[PDB]
Design a protein around this ligand. Structure first.
Ligand SMILES: *[C@H]1O[C@H](CO)[C@H](O)[C@H](O)[C@H]1NC(C)=O
Ligand SMILES: *[C@H]1O[C@H](CO)[C@H](O)[C@H](O)[C@H]1NC(C)=O
Length: 7
């Protein structure tokens, strides 16, 4: 389970 790129 990964995540999106921090804005
Ligand atoms: C985390 O990154 C992976 C790539 O290895 C997938 O794109 C996955 O869908 C991502 N998870 C989220 C919650 O964006
Ligand atoms: C990145 O975007 C994804 C879209 O599914 C999720 O909302 C995730 O929580 C976001 N990550 C951050 C750090 O905001």
């Amino acid at each position: 389970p990964t995540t999106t790129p921090l804005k």
